[PDB]
Amino acid sequence: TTDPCAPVKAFMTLANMMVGFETIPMDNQIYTQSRRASAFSTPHTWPRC
Amino acid sequence: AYIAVPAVVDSRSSEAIGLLESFGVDAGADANDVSYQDHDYVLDQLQYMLDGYEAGDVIDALVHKNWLHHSVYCLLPPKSQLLEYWKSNPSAIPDNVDRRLRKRLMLKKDLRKDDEYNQLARAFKISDVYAPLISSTTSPMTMIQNLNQGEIVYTTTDRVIGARILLYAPRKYYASTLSFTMTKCIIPVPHSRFNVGTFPSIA
Amino acid sequence: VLLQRISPLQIDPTIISNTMSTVSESTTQTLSPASSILGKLRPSNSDFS
Amino acid sequence: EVLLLPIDHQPANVTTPTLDFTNELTNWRARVCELMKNLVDNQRYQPGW
Amino acid sequence: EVLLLPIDHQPANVTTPTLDFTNELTNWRARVCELMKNLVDNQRYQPGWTQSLVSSMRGTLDKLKLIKSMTPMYLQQLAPVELAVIAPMLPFPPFQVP
Amino acid sequence: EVLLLPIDHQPANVTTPTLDFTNELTNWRARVCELMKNLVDNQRYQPGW
């Protein structure tokens, strides 16, 4: 796909499936580790980890 | 001036009989000063409401009703039946409806397998078009408040109280009970100085 | 009413409708912002009291 | 001999450009539209889309 | 003006909640599940079971531990607020001991 | 006279193609498969199967 935020959506897909099994630090309390991977659509939402 | 008496009052029967004279009121000579409300339909609506809810909250809600202000309920068919009724006679669609839905509804073609109309159909909600909706879960107090403020109160259920209910669509689409006593035909009064009713109010 | 009958201004809601002229994807379920604002504005109504 | 108004007034001239930000009312519309861009620019305030 | 609660209350900081496991009730569930795992894996108990049954039980315990329930977070972030807004209009005012 | 692409391009040097695994997308498929094997062989996950 030509969506520039594709690599992040690939990463967050596995992070969503592994909540409670493996934990990583997010940025804020809005875009947490259980937020749907479809929401990560803009460059500003790319996590630091 | 609204006066409440502990008896059932009707427009014609309570006028024919001396209800005020029965209670002991002195004669008023010309009767143009007084006018009687009709609350028998309100009473059977009260029984119907009591069938579903508790007595106390329904009574408390009905206390706050202003009998000097007119308003009516507009009963709508279910969502699907409303869609077919709009598909027929397409002049009925209001302006608030989505442009894509309106154009697709004018398709005048079998829309079962278009799937764009279908995804729009799952997307559609009646509350989007009509703001005041009882939705069969609304509290009686909220019913009475929405009836007090405004003239037309839209509803999707028949278990309401306070005013006459008018159909929005032909009877074919409605599959509910044939409560013709409160439900009128699909197609379509000043107060005197003194108005006599049954239920007291504190509005 | 007196002001309306003497002012050269004329209110034509079709200006809003013509300029929008946009559309969203068929699969896109979120209603295009264009169709959303048009529903709120209601250009067909002609009362301006 | 005076009549107060809640907005500013200027001498009549029909050859005024439409996009004249000197006009107070036109300037107000532009400022509001610019703010709404900053609100939806980074999708910070719109999760669940 | 004070209500007591038998569980810890932590006010929520967002209006759009998502799933969260940082709760005392979730910790309680995890500890119970791991205790049962230890009991099953004890060497004085395992030899009396078939290998397939042991594997199935361990998988079941893992699934129960990792189930996605919102009730423990609701009980920590929202139920006290509802109780507080309901209390002042009760016919029988609350009567509590520590 | 320039056309951009989102993937690497390498001109072919033969007119009779044959199966080849030296590609970006072939490496991508292999890496994903090996990742899932590591998850299955993990000490925290294997005993449950």
Add this chain to the structure above:
Amino acid sequence: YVRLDRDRVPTMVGVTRQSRDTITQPALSLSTTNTTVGVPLALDARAIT
């Protein structure tokens, strides 16, 4: 196309057809007299894989 360089990710594309109050040079009014252009299209990952 950028790979993972977030700093170079495009965020908008705009076209202009007018000028503002008194500016005559296009380079001095392009930034604030443009209309954003773009639309997303959805695909099915089930079919592509």
Add this chain to the structure above:
Amino acid sequence: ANVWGVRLADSLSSPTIETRTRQYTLHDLCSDLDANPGREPWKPLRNQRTNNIVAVQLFRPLQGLVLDTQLYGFPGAFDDWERFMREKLRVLKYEVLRIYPISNYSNEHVNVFVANALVGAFLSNQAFYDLLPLLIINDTMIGDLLGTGASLSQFFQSHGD
């Protein structure tokens, strides 16, 4: 004198002079995060019969560990724990230095509450990126923490003033 069976000496004594206090700066925070062998934010405690390290005392920072031990998931032995803490603190030091260069904020004052909360959140793998803009004191520690209103809320709650 005697009290309930606790004997007391017949003389009195007390300290006389207090030490002046010094503020906490970015250089101090960075030196603390760089746990050099000479100075650490921790000190070991030993058993008095086997002379074995069994516990450790935590100075500042590392005073914000409020969650369960399992969440942190520390190594058991003292040497392994020391190493683990050193590698984990290095990354946090670089993360804070990314936002605050030493050439500009060399002698600024840092908020102790925010420092402790940041270290605790990072060690417990929680959302800590929001605490960074509050690291440097603006007017007052308590005022800055009171004015935030909406934070993680497992570290700070505001009850008015």
